[PDB]
Amino acid sequence: LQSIPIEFQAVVFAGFGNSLYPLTGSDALPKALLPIGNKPMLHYPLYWLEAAGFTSAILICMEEAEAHINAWLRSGYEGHMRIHVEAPTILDDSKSSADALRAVSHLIKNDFVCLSCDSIVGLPPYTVLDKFRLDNPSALAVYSPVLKYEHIDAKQLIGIEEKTSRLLYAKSSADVGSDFTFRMSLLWKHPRVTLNTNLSDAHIFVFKHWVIDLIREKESISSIRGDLIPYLVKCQYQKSFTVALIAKDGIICSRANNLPNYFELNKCIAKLTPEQRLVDVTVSERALVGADCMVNEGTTIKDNSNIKKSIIGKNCVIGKGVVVSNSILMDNIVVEDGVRLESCIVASGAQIGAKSKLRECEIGVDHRVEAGRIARGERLVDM
């Protein structure tokens, strides 16, 4: 019944992002709660882990985001799965995933699946786990083709030895910029290596348990994409391993699998709409039309406006002649009456008024907008 021990325990990192700058200067609602399909960003890594068989997951959080994340977990979070939320004090903006992983090192006992809150994954879970089981590496990372950006970040350089799945080069495709070297010792072992600038890090990792203490004792390793680099299995290696060989693997495919670490909130949200009929639970009036578009609950939009190819969240009414096209609407947004939102992302709690025309503009949380048409800007409220 429970004769079975725990094979993997899942850890999800939800730091608050300095990218998505207009969306995330908030302590109101954190990055991990930014909606995609009118469901918070955190929904999808948790949905994927639950379908993977997991029943318990550890969510490393930021202490400012501590309260609000907990709040959504008790109510709103669909997937019947339990999330232990530790926001260690130590973590702060000047950090990324792996130190957050080190602050809770004592909680990690088995082999651990390391995920990000911005990991929108449609890749079938078994293919990920079975590969880690069958190959039995110290670590396996998932990659995917970069997004195609229908709409009008730094490229990834990944050199894997095809046919073993071994990963032999993981440096970013900016950064080392001047000469981009490959040490010849890597060509006498593994003489045939495929390089790719076509791929993007999917922030999906599975580590053999001994890795967690390579994190513990080695202090310099800040983020995982600054921790996978230094695996090296071929070099001189005088780094005091205690703990036959070290083998790091990668995997790729043609399905939806990427990171809203960048502006890609937009394109992922767009992508996220293979669906059928629009939900009943909001009211929209005759004298108007919406289609092919997502509207959430308890939003209202009155007569002659237009909702074309967009996303509308909970708690919002829209009306008096509005045309919103190719745009995204979040929550608590009093779309003043009659506006034009073509290709825009508006943050929650934000009021926008007196005819405000935004094209390709991102407007932050708790931010009113009045009249005042502009195109370039991400704005705003002061200081």
Partner 1 sequence: KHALQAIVLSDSYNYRFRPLTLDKPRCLLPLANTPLIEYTFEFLALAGVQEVYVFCCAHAGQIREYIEKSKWNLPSSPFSVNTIVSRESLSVGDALRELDSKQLITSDFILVSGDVVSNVPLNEVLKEHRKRREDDKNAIMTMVVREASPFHRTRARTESSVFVIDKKTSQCVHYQANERGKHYVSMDPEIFNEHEELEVRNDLIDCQIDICSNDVPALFTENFDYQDIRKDFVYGVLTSDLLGKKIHCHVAKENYAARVRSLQTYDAISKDVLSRWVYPFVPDSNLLNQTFSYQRHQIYKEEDVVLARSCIIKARTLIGAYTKVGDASVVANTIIGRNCTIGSNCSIDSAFLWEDVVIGDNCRIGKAILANSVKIGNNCSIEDGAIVAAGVVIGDNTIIEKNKRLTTFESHSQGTLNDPSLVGIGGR
Partner 2 sequence: IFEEKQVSIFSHLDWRRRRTTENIPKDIHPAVIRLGLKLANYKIFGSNQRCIDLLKTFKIVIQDYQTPYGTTLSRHLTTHINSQIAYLVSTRPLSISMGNAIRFLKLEISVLDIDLTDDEGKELLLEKIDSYIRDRIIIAGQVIVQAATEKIQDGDVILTYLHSSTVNDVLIHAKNVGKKFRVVVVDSRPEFEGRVCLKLLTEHGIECTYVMISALSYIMQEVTKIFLGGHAMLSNGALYSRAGTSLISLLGHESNVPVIACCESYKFTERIQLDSLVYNELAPGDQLVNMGVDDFEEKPGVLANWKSVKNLKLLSLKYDVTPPRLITVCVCEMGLLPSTSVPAIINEF
Residues that bind partner 2 (CB under 8 A): 1-5, 7, 53, 124, 126-127, 129-130, 133-134, 163
Closest CA to 137 of 164, 155, 161, 172: 164
Nearer to partner 1, 235 or 289 (CB): 235
* From 74, 80, 82, 183, residue interacting with partner 1 (rule: CB under 8 A): 183
124: which 2 tokens?
């079938």
Helices (H), 26-108: 43-51, 66-74, 97-103
Tell me, rounded to whole angstroms, the distance of Cα 40 from its chain centroid.
11
CB of 3 to partner 2, least distance (A): 5
Q: CB of 263 within 8 A of CB of 360?
A: no
φ and ψ of 71, to 5 deg: -60, -45
Task: Name the minimum Å distance from CB 150 to partner 1.
Answer: 19
The tokens describing 29, both together, are: 């609602």
118 to 20, 33, 157: CA distances (angstroms): 12, 10, 21
Q: Among the candidate windows 48-56, 174-182, 287-295, 313-321, which touches partner 1 by CB under 8 A?
A: 174-182
Tell me whether strands 248-251 and 139-145 are parallel, antiparallel or unpaired.
parallel
Smallest separation (angstroms) from partner 1 to the CB of 185:
7
The stretch among 95-103, 120-128, 129-137, 176-184 that binds partner 1 (CB under 8 A) is 176-184
Q: Give, as ranges, the residues between 121 and 160 that touch partner 1 (CB under 8 A).
A: 155, 157, 159
Q: Quick one: which of 73, 195, 256, 323 contacts partner 1 (CB under 8 A)?
A: 195
Among residues 74 and 192, whose Cβ is nearest to partner 1?
A: 192
Residue 184, φ and ψ in degrees, nearest 5:
-60, -20
In the bound state with partner 2, the residue whose beta carbon lies nearer, of 131 and 271, is 131
How far apart (Å, rounded) are the C-alpha atoms in residues 343 and 340?
A: 10
| Residue 3 vs 240, nearer CB to partner 2 | 3
Q: After which residues is the chain broken (C to N over 2.5 A)?
A: 152, 243
* Residue number with CB closer to partner 1 (179 or 219): 179
Shortest separation between residue 120's beta carbon and partner 2, angstroms: 20
181 part of the interface to partner 1, by CB under 8 A: yes
Q: Which pair of tokens denotes residue 171?
A: 């440096």
Q: Is the dihedral of CA 163, 165, 169, 171 positive or negative?
A: positive
| 238 contact choice in partner 1, partner 2, none (CB below 5 to 8 Å, kind-dependent) | none
Taking the complex as a whole, how short is the minimal distance between the CB of residue 125 and partner 2, in angstroms?
8
d(CA 370, CA 356): 6
In the complex with partner 1, the residue whose CB is nearer, 232 or 278, is 232
Query: Min. distance of Cβ 194 from partner 1 in angstroms?
Result: 5
Q: What is the spatial distance between Cα 352 and Cα 370, in angstroms, rounded to a whole number?
A: 6
Among 187, 279, 281, 381, binds partner 1 (CB under 8 A): 187
Answer yes or no whether residue 191 interacts with partner 1 by CB under 8 A. Answer: yes
**Residue 134's binding partner out of partner 2, partner 1, none, with CB under 5 to 8 Å set by partner kind:** partner 2
Number of residues that bind partner 1 (CB under 8 A): 22
Residue 192 near partner 1 by CB under 8 A: yes
SS3 9: strand
Residue type, 215: I
For the packed helices 125-135 and 43-51, what is the interaxial angle rounded to 10 degrees? 60
Torsion-angle region of 366 (φ positive above 0: left; ψ -120 to 50: alpha; else: beta): left
Beta carbon of residue 171, minimum distance to partner 1 (angstroms, whole number):
11
Contacted by 191, from partner 1, partner 2, none: CB < 5 to 8 Å by type: partner 1
Interface contacts to partner 1, rule CB under 8 A:
155, 157, 159, 173, 177, 179-185, 187-188, 191-198
